[PDB]
Amino acid sequence: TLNGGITDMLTELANFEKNVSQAIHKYNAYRKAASVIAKYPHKIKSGAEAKKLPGVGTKIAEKIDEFLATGKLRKLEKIRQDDTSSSINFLTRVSGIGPSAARKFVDEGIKTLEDLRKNEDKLNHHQRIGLKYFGDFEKRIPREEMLQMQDIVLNEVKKVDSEYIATVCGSFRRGAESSGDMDVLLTHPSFTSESTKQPKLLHQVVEQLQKVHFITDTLSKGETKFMGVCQLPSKNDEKEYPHRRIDIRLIPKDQYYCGVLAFTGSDIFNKNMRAHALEKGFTINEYTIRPLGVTGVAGEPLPVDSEKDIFDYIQWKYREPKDRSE
DNA sequence: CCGACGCCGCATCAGC
DNA sequence: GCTGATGCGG
């Protein structure tokens, strides 16, 4: 983090553009700039120097020059002082409360943690659980705890059916020493691109994890995606572990490689990789990589037998999970 | 300048 | 109830 100060500034800027301005493309531009700057191996000495990076344009170049000179950015100092922006930014920190709901709540005079608690009845289920575990969800997860959580998920899954394969992805697969949450990829041979030979495949698994009191709440749940809350068991007299966010994603077993690539990320890595794919004439999702027709219409799925095979198609050298944290 | 900017699951809403 | 749009977050 040679440029930690600059990247923090951009990140705050992006957050403003998303939560207050509701400008998703500006949100993404800042995040892209923050990401590129973040892997740049020199302490940036000037805006001109940063503007050599792809993603960093004239405005960000100017903002960087101001930051390096003063240590601050007037634009931000102002935003920080605007109550509406401050409140909207805060409220969006609760899971399930987005920029729209945040601006709505602040219109009603609901604008603090306390207002939220006193108005649970105005929250949907997701928002209610996000607020319940607000403080908890702020905390990160040491890798040691992720290893613990991994053993529990992987072993309980075999208790439901030994044909199941659960793979922890997200930041954990990228080798991060701590994760904001746990992301699990699930396959079962009875669920492929070609048929759904069994129902409840995800339910079965969610239930068992609840049965053993690992999963504690649910944010949302469908036939292939579960979003909820979990917690490690604590020892005698031991204070309890923080409640943690968990997402489980059941994908067609034949499409594992696109799946694991997709849920491994990072989110920005994906955005960069899929756009380059578009530049190279393919579309990549969590299921498939397909060619674009002269019209811009996805063709048929190409044969994939490894994550590397996906990289090949778009003419990128393979990058280990650890080198995908953009 | 201009159009594009990754791609998708689930929850909720409106409208029929 | 269904279908499409919008929110939200992955």
Place this chain on the structure above:
DNA sequence: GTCGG
């Protein structure tokens, strides 16, 4: 906000 074209 940035970029290829």
